[PDB]
Design a protein around this ligand. Structure first.
Ligand SMILES: COc1ccc(S(=O)(=O)N(CC(=O)NO)CC(C)C)cc1
Ligand SMILES: [Ca+2]
Ligand SMILES: [Ca+2]
Ligand SMILES: [Ca+2]
Ligand SMILES: [Zn+2]
Ligand SMILES: [Zn+2]
Length: 159
């Protein structure tokens, strides 16, 4: 007797894949985006296309009943939630948009780091250097790191 856990394994699955690029790249961006946080936090992400996952990545295109569901080339990028019931855990992205591996446009990996942040449950940061922030900035993948302000935020997640 002695049940214990604290996430450990973030099992995730994508609902569909942006045909805009090669699927490999599509999951690569979101994979890597997770991985970034999965490196810093003790969380261990795991994509599984075959089975049942804990969270779900909802790429939807100008559809689904919401207030700000999704919209075309601009407007909403993506919205997702960690600490909540039902949808909580799961992460929704504007498939309507033409996301790009290259920085030019909207980089999937870039936005993904923030939405993955939502799913893990990180609090909205308030510094332009953080990626969890509600704002956007053209972060250079050359650097590939999280801000100090961000890092305290993520470590706030005891699990
Ligand atoms: C890190 O990637 C982001 C991309 C877009 C935005 S946004 O400012 O266009 N926006 C969407 C968003 O925050 N998604 O998580 C909120 C908007 C209502 C101002 C924010 C972060
Ligand atoms: Ca949009
Ligand atoms: Ca959920
Ligand atoms: Ca798309
Ligand atoms: Zn929605
Ligand atoms: Zn946000």
């Amino acid at each position: 007797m002695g049940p214990v856990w604290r996430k450990h394994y973030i099992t995730y699955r994508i609902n569909n894949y942006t045909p805009d690029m090669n699927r490999e790249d599509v999951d690569y961006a979101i994979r890597k985006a997770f991985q970034v946080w999965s490196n810093v936090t003790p969380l261990k992400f795991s994509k599984i296309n075959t089975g049942m996952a804990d969270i779900l990545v909802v790429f939807a295109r100008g559809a689904h009943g919401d207030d700000h569901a999704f919209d075309g080339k601009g407007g909403i990028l993506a919205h997702a939630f960690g600490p909540g019931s039902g949808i909580g855990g799961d992460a929704h992205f504007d498939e309507d948009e033409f996301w790009t591996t290259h920085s030019g446009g909207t980089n999937l990996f870039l936005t993904a780091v923030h939405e993955i942040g939502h799913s893990l449950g990180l609090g909205h940061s308030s510094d332009p250097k953080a990626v969890m922030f509600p704002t956007y900035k053209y972060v250079d993948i050359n650097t590939f790191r999280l801000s100090a302000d961000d890092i305290r935020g993520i470590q706030s997640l005891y699990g």
